[PDB]
Amino acid sequence: AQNTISGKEGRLFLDGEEMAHIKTFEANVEKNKSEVNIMGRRMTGHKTTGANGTGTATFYKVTSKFVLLMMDYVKKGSDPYFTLQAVLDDQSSGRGTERVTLYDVNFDSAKIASLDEEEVPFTFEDFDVPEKLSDTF
């Protein structure tokens, strides 16, 4: 419901290579079973490496390279783990503006090769808000 999380303009890196300037994206930390407030205490706190969840996001541009890359992946019939590192867009501004990373976000290869709708599903295995941003500006 409101246990959501989203951020403006971001980039996802496959083991180091930037591979898509992904725009608006919005995830959802899953609130499952015995765990009071998973999200609350991850943005601000030490907790289980949980923060696993589902989500959706739309890409801005698509590099041929990337597509072809993804193809070689779906060929081997596997889905890779990219790391999506964007800019948080919480308007509440409980603080200011920090970077959000989504460890192990993961889409269906094919679904990506098909990029050339735009809202693609994906499932990160952990989320994070490590640093603030453009200090003093």
Next chain:
Amino acid sequence: AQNTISGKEGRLFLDGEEMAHIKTFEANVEKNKSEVNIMGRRMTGHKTTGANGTGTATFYKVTSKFVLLMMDYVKKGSDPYFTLQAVLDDQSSGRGTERVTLYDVNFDSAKIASLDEEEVPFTFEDFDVPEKL
């Protein structure tokens, strides 16, 4: 992916009572396991009572009655099964324009009481395109 389904202006009935003029809605027949083309042959054909799936939809207006009704439901901690009967919006127009019903669509009570975002989730247990229009 494209195994989607959606329809313009619709209405969901709880055992006979209309309870929300739900606008745009968009479901997703789940393609699971041993089952070639589930959807394809349900719109046009006899098949398993499957066509179970997940989806999303946004409501147009919300009757206080309904909200309060839903509240009495979440009270008893249960989620009721509504029948969403809308008008199909397939632009391809393989035929024309038919009604689409979503047997046993079901949202989270609370989620609905909270109506007074708008895209609410729900999980029908079967879909259908019975008549034209």
